[PDB]
Amino acid sequence: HXXCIPXEXVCX
Secondary structure (H helix, E strand, O other): OOOEOOOOOOEO
16 A cells, blocks of 8 residues: 555555
């Protein structure tokens, strides 16, 4: 939701 952060973070 709202984007993705690769490494430390989430997709969605």
